[PDB]
Short mmCIF file of C-alpha atoms and ligand atoms in Angstrom, two decimals:
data_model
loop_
_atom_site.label_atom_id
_atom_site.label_comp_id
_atom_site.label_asym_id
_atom_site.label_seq_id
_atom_site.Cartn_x
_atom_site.Cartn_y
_atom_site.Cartn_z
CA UNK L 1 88.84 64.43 88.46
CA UNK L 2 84.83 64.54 88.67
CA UNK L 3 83.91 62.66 91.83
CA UNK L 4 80.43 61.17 93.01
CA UNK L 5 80.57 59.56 96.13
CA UNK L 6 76.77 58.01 97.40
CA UNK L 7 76.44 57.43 101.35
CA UNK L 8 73.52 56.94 103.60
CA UNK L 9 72.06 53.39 102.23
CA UNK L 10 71.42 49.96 103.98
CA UNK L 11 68.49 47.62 105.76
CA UNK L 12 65.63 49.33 106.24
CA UNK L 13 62.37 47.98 107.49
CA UNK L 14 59.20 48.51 105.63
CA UNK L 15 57.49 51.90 106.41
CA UNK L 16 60.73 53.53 107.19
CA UNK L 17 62.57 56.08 106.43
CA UNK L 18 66.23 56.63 105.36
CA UNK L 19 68.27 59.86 103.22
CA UNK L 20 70.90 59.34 100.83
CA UNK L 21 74.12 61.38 100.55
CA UNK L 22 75.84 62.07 97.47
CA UNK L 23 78.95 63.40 97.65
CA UNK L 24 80.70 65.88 94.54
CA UNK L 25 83.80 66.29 94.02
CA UNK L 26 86.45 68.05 90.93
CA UNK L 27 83.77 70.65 89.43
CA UNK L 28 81.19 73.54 90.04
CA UNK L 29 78.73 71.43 91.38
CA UNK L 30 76.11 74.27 91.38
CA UNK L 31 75.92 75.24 87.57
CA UNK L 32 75.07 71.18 87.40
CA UNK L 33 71.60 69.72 87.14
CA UNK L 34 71.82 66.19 89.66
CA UNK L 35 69.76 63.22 89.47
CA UNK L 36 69.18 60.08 91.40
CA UNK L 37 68.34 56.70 89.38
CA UNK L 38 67.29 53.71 90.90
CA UNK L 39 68.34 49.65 89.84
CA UNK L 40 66.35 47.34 91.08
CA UNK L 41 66.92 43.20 91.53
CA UNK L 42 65.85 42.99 88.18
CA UNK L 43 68.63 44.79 86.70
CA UNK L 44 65.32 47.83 85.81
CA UNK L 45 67.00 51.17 86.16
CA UNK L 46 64.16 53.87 87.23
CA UNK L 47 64.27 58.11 87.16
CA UNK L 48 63.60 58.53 90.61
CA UNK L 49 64.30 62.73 90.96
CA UNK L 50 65.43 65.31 89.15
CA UNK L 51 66.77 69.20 90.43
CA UNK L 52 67.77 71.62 88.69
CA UNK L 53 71.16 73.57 89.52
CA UNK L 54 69.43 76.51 91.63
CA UNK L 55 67.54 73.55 93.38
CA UNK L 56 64.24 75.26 92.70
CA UNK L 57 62.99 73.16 89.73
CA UNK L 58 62.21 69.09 90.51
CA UNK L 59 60.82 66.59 89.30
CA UNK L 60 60.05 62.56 90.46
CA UNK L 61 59.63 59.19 88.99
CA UNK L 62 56.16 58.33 88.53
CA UNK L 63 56.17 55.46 91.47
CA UNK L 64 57.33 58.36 93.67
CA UNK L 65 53.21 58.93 94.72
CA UNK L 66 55.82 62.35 97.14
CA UNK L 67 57.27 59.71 99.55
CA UNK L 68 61.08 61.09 97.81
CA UNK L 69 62.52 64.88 98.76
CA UNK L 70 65.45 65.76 96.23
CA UNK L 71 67.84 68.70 97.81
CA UNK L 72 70.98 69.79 97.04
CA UNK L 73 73.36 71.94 99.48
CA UNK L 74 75.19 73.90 96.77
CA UNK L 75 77.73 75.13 99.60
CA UNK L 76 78.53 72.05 100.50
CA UNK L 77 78.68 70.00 97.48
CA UNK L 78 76.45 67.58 98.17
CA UNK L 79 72.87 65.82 96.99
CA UNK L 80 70.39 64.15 99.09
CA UNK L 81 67.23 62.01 98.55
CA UNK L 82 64.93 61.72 101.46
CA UNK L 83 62.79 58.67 101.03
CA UNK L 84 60.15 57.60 103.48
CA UNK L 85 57.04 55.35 103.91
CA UNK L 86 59.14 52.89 102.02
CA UNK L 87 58.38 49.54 100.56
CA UNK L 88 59.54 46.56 98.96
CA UNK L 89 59.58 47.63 95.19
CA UNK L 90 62.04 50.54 96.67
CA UNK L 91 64.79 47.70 97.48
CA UNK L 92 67.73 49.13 94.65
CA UNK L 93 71.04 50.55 94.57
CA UNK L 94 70.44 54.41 94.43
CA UNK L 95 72.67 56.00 91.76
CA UNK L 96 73.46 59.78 91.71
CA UNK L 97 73.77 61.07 88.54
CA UNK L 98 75.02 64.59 87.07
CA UNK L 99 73.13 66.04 84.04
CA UNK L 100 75.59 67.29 80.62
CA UNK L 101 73.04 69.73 78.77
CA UNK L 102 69.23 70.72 78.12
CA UNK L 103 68.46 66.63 76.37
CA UNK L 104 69.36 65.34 80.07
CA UNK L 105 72.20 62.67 79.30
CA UNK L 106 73.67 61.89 82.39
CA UNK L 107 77.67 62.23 81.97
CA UNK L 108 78.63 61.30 85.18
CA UNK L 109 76.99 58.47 87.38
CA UNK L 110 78.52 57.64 91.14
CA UNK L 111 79.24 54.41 92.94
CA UNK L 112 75.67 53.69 94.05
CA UNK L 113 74.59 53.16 97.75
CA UNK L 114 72.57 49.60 98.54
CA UNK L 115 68.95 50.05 100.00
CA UNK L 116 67.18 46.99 101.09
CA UNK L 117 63.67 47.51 102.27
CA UNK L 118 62.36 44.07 104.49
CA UNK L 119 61.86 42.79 107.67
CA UNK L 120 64.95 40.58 107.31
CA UNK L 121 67.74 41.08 110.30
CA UNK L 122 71.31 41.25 109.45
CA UNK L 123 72.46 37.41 109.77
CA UNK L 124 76.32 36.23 109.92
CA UNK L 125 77.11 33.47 107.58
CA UNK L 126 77.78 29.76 108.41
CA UNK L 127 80.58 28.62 106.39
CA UNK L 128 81.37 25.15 105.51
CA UNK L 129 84.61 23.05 104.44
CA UNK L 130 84.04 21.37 100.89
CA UNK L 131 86.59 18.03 100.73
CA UNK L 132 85.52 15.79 98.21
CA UNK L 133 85.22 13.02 100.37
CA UNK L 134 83.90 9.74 99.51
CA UNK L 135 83.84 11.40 95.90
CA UNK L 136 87.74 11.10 95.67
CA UNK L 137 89.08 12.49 92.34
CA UNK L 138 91.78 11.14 90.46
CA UNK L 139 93.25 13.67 88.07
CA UNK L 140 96.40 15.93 87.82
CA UNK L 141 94.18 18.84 89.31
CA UNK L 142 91.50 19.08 92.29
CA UNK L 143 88.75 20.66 93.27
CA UNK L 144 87.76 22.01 96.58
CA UNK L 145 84.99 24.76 97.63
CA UNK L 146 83.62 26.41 100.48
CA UNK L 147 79.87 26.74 100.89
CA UNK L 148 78.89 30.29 102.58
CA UNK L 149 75.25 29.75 104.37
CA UNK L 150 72.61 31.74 105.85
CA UNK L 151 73.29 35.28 105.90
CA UNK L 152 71.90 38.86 105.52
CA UNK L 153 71.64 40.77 103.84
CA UNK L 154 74.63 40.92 100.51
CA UNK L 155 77.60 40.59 100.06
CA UNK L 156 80.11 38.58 101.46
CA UNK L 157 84.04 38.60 99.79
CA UNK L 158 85.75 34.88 99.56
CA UNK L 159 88.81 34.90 98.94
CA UNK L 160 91.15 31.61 99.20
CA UNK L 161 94.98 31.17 100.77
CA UNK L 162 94.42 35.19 101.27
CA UNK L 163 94.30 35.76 97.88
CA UNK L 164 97.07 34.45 97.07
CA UNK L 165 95.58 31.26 94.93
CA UNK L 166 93.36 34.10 92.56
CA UNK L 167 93.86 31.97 89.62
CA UNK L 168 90.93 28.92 89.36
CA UNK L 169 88.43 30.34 91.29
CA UNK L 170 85.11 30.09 90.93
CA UNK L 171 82.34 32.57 93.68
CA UNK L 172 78.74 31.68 92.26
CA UNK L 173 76.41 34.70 92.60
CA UNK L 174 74.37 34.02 95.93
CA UNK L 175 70.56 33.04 95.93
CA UNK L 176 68.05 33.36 98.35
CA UNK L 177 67.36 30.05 100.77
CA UNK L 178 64.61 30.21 103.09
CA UNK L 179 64.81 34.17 102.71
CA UNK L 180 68.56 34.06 103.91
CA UNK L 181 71.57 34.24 101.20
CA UNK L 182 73.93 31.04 99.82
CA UNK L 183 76.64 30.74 98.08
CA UNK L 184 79.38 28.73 97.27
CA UNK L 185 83.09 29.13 95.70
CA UNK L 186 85.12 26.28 94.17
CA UNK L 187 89.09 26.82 93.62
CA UNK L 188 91.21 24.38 91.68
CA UNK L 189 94.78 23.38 92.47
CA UNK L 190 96.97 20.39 91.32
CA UNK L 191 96.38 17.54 92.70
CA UNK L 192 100.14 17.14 93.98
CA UNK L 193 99.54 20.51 96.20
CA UNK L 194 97.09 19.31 98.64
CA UNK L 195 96.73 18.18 101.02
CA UNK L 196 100.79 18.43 100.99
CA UNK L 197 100.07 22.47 100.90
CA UNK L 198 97.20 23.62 102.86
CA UNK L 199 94.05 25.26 101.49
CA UNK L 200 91.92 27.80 103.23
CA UNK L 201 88.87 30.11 101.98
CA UNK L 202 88.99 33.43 103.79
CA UNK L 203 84.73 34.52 104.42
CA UNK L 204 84.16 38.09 104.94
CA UNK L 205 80.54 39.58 105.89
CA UNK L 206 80.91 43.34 106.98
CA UNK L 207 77.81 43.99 107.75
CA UNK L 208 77.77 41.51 110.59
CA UNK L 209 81.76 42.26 111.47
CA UNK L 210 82.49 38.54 110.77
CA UNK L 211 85.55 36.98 109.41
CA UNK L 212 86.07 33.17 109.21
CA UNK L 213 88.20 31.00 107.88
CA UNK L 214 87.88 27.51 106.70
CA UNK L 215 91.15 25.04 106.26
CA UNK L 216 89.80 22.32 103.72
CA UNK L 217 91.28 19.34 105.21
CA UNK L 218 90.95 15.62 103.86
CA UNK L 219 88.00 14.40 105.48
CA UNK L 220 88.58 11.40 108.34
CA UNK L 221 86.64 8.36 107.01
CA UNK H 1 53.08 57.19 79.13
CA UNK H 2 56.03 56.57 76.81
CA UNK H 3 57.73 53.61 77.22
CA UNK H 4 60.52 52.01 75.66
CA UNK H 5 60.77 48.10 74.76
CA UNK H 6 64.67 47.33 73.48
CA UNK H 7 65.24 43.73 71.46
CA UNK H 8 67.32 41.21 71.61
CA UNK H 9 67.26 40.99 75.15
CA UNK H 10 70.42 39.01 74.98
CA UNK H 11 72.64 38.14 72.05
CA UNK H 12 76.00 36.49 71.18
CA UNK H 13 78.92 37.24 68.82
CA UNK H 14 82.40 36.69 68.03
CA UNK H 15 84.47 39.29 67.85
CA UNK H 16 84.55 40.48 64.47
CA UNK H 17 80.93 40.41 64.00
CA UNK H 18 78.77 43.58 63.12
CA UNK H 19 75.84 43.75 66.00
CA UNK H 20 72.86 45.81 66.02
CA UNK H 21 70.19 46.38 68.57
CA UNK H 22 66.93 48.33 68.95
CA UNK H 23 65.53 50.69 71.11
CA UNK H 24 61.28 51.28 70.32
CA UNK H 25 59.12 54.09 71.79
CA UNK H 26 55.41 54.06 71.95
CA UNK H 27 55.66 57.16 70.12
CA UNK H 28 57.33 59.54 68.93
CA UNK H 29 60.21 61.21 70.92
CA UNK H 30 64.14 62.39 69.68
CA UNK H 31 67.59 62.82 71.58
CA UNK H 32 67.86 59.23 72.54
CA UNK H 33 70.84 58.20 75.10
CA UNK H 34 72.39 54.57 75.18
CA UNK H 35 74.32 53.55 78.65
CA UNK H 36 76.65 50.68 78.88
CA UNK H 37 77.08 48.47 82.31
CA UNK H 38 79.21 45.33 82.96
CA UNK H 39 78.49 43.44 86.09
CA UNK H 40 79.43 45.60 89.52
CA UNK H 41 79.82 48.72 88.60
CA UNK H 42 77.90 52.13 87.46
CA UNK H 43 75.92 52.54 83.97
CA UNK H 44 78.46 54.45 81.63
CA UNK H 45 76.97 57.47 78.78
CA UNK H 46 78.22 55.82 75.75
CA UNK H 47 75.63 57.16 72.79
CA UNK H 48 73.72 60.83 73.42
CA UNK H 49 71.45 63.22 71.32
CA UNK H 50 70.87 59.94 68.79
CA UNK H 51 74.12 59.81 67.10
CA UNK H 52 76.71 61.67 69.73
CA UNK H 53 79.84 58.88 70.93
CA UNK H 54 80.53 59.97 74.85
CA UNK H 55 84.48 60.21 75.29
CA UNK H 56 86.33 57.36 75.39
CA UNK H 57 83.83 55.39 72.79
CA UNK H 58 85.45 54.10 70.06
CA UNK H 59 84.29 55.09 66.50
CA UNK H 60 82.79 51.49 66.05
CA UNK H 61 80.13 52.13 67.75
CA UNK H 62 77.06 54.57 66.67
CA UNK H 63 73.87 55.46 67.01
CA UNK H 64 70.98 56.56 65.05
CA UNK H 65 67.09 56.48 64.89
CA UNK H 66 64.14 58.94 64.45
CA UNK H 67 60.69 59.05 65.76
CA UNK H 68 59.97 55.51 67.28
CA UNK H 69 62.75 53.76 66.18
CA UNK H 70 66.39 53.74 67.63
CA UNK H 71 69.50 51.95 67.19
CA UNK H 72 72.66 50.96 68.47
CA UNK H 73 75.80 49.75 66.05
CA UNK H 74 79.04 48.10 66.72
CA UNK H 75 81.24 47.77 63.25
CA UNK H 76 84.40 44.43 64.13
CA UNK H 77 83.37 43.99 67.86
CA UNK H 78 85.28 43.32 70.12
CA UNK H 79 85.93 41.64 73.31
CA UNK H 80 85.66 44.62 75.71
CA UNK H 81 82.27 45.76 73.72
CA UNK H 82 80.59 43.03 75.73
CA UNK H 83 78.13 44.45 78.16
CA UNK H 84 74.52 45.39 78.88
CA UNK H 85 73.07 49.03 76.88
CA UNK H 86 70.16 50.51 78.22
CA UNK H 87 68.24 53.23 75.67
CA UNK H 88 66.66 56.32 77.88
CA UNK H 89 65.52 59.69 76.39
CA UNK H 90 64.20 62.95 78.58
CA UNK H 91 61.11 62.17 79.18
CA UNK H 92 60.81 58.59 79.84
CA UNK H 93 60.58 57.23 83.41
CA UNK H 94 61.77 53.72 83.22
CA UNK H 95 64.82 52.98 80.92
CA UNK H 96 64.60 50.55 78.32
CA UNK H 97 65.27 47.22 80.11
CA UNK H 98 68.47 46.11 78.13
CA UNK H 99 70.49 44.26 75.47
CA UNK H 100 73.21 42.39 76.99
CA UNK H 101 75.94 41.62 74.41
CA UNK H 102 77.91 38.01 75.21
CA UNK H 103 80.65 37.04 73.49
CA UNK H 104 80.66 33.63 71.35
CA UNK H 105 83.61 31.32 71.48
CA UNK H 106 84.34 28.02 71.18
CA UNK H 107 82.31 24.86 72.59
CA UNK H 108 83.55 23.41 75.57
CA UNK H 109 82.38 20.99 77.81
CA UNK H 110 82.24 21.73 82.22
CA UNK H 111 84.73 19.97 84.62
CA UNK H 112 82.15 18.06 86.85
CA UNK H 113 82.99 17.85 90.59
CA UNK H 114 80.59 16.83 93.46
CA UNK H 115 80.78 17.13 97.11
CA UNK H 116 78.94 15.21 99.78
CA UNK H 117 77.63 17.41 102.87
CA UNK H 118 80.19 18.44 105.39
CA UNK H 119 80.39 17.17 108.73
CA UNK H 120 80.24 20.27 110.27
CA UNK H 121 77.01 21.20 108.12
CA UNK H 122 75.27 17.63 108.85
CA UNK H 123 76.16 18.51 112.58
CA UNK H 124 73.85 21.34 112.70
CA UNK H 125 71.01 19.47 111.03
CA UNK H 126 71.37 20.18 107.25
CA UNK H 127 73.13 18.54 104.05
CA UNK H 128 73.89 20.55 100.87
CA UNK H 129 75.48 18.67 98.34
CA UNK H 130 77.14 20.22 96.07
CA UNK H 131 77.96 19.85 92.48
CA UNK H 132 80.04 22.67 90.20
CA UNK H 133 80.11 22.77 86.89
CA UNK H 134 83.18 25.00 85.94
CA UNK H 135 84.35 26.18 82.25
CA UNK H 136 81.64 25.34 80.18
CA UNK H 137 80.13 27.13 76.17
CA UNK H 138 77.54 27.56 75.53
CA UNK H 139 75.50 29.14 78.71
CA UNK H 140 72.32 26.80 78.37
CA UNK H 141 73.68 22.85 80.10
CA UNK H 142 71.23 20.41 81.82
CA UNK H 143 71.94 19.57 85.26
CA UNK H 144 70.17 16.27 86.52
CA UNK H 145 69.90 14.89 90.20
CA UNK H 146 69.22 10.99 91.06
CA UNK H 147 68.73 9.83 94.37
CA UNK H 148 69.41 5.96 94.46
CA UNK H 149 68.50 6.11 90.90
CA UNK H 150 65.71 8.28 90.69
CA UNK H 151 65.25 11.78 89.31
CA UNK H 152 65.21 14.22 92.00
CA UNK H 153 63.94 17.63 91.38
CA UNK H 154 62.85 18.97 94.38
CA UNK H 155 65.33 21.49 96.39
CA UNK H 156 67.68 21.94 93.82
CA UNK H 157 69.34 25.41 93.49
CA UNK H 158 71.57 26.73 90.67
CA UNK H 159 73.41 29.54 89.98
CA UNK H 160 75.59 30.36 86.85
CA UNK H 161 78.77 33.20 86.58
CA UNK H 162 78.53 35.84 84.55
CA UNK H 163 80.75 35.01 81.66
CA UNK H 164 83.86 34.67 82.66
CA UNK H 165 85.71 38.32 81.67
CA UNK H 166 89.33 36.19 80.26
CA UNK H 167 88.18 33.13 78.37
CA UNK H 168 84.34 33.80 77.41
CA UNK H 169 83.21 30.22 79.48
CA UNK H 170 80.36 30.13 81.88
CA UNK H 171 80.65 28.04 85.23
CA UNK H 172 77.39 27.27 87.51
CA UNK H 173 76.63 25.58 90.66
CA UNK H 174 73.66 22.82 90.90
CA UNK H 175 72.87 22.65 95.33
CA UNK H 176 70.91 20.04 96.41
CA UNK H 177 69.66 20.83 99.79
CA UNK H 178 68.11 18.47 102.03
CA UNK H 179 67.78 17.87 105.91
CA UNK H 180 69.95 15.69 107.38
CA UNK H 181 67.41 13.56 108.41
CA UNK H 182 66.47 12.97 104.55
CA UNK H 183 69.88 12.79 103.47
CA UNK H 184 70.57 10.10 106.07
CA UNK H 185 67.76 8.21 104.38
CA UNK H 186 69.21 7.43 101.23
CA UNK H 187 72.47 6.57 99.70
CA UNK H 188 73.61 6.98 96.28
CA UNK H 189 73.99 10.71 94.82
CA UNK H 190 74.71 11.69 91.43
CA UNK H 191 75.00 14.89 89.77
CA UNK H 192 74.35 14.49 85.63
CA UNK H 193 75.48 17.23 83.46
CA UNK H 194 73.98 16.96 79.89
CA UNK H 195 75.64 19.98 77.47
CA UNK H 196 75.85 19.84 73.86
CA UNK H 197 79.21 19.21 73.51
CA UNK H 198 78.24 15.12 73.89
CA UNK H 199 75.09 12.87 73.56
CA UNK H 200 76.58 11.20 76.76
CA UNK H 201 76.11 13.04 79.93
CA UNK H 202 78.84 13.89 82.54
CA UNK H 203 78.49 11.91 85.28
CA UNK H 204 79.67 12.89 89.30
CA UNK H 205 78.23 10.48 92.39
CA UNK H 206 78.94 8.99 95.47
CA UNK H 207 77.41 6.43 98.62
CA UNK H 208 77.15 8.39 101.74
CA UNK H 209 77.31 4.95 103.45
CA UNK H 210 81.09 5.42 102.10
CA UNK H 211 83.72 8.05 104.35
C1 LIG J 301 62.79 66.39 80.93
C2 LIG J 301 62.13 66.95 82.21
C3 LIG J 301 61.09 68.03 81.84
C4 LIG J 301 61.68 69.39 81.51
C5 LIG J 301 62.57 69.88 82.60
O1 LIG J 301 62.59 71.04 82.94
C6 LIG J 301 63.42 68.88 83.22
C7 LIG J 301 63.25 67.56 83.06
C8 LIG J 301 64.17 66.59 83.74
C9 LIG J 301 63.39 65.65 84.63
C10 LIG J 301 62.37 64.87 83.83
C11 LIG J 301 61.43 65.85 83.07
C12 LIG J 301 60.27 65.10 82.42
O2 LIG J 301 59.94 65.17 81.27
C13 LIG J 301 59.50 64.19 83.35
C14 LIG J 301 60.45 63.17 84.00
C15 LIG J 301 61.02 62.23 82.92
C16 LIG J 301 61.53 63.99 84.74
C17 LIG J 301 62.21 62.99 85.68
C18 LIG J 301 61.14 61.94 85.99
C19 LIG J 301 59.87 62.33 85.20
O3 LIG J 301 59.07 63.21 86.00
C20 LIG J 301 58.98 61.14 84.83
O4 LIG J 301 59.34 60.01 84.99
C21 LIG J 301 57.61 61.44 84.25
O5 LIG J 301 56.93 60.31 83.77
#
């Protein structure tokens, strides 16, 4: 029923400039008071703007320092957050939020849109076959991986055999490597399946348009 | 400027348990709202006004608190109660920074695999190796790196799972990175996993000089 649908975020350099979308949907968005709220890496959520239904009440986190607009276009449904001069400590996922009564709980919260504030350029992954190698195992079950290398900025989506081996699978959250992300994903299978029955991680990075796959073959020694 | 402080920061329980967690103000404010999150998606309204359950929120959970003090309750928990809660009230800029609830379960001890760098990888210049440690309880293991039999410590990256959401274990990754130049240097690599499930380590390795 009640939609909120966030648009407008991605890599932004420092000192620029960028406006948010938020999307409403299923209910009189103008008897509503909106808000947008702000996670950062470290999981800290901040108040970053507050309007009132009418639009002419407002009111801003207290890192704000006026580089953040709040509007709302009651005709068409929709919130925005201008943000400008930005910096590093602005680098969050940008929540909008819709207000219940006059103690400001926020009933409804929407997807979030991704804004990354750095000098970092958007970076395709290098992706890498994980055999085991000269570290043969022995057991009724294996385990292979994939490591995902290099790229800019989050996320990527691994999936292995197309999804169809969704069971025993392991994608590590990704860490930062000479400013540049890395992961890796392990998937186990039994031992009698492969090589017999071929294995193949499946590396998607949409914001570089890149798809590659990687057959995990048994390495030539 | 009020601020709110929240403890424990994290905490464990089986299901079954009764947990309680705190929300503190630096003075005195009322009408406090609790927000649950679990890992990719949006904070939830779960407690509001103090004491009010959102919709949905079973009537295990509540809320209460005056002045500077404020409290979330789960009566039995359960499984699906596990998640992060985040106090906020009106007039407070930054929300409280959290209590994530983890769910306690039975020791177990990681399935240790290793992988030397790929050809491919040591083509371009670079050697990861890589060593999982999948399926483990509790969260807190000891991962250990020795090149030709000493400790390495230097260039080692880990990275554990959120607990995993159908059998409560934990599985991390231990990446030592190295040029290829370095790694061609040296010969024996072992990954050492040290959890308290054993007094004896878990032990992963190979000779590069082998394949
Ligand atoms: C309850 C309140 C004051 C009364 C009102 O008509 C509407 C609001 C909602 C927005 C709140 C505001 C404050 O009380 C000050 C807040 C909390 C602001 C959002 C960010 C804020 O400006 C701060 O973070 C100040 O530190």
């Amino acid at each position: 029923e009640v939609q909120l649908v966030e648009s407008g975020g991605g890599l932004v350099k420092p000192g620029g400039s960028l406006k948010l979308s938020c999307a409403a949907s299923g209910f009189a968005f103008g008897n509503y008071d909106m808000s947008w709220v702000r996670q950062t890496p470290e999981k800290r959520l901040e108040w970053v703007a507050f309007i009132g239904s009418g639009g002419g009440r407002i009111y801003y986190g207290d890192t704000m320092k006026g580089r953040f607009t709040i509007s709302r276009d009651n005709a068409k449904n929709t919130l925005y957050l201008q943000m400008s001069s930005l910096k590093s400590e602005d680098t969050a996922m940008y929540y909008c939020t819709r207000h219940y009564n006059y103690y400001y709980s926020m009933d409804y919260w929407g997807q979030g849109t991704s804004v990354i504030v750095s000098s970092a350029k958007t970076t395709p992954p290098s992706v890498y076959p994980l055999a085991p190698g000269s570290a043969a195992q022995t057991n009724s079950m294996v385990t292979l991986g994939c490591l995902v290398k290099g790229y800019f900025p989050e996320p990527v989506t691994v999936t292995w055999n197309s999804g169809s081996l969704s069971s025993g699978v392991h994608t590590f959250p990704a860490v930062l490597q000479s400013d540049l992300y890395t992961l890796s994903s392990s998937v186990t299978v039994p031992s009698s399946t492969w090589p017999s029955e071929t294995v193949t991680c499946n590396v998607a990075h949409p914001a570089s348009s890149t798809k590659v796959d990687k057959k995990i073959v048994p390495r030539d020694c | 400027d009020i601020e709110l402080t929240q403890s424990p920061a994290v905490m464990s329980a089986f299901p079954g348990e009764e947990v309680t967690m705190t929300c503190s103000a630096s003075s005195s404010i009322n009408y406090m709202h609790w927000y649950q999150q679990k890992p990719g998606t949006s904070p939830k309204r779960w407690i509001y006004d103090t004491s009010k359950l959102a919709s949905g929120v079973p009537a295990r959970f509540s809320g209460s608190g005056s002045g500077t003090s404020y409290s979330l309750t789960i009566s039995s928990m359960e499984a699906e109660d596990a998640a992060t809660y985040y106090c906020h009230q009106r007039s407070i800029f930054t929300f409280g920074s959290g209590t994530k609830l983890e769910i306690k379960r039975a020791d177990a001890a990681p399935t240790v695999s290793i992988f030397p760098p790929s050809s491919e990888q040591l083509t371009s210049g670079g050697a990861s190796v890589v060593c999982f440690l999948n399926n483990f309880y509790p969260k807190d293991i000891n991962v250990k790196w020795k090149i030709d039999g000493s400790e390495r410590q230097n260039g080692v990256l880990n990275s554990w799972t959120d607990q995993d959401s159908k059998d409560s274990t934990y599985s991390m990754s231990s990446t030592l990175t190295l040029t290829k130049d370095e790694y061609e240097r040296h010969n024996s690599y072992t990954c050492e996993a040290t959890h308290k499930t054993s007094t004896s380590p878990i032990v992963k390795s190979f000779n590069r000089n082998e394949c």
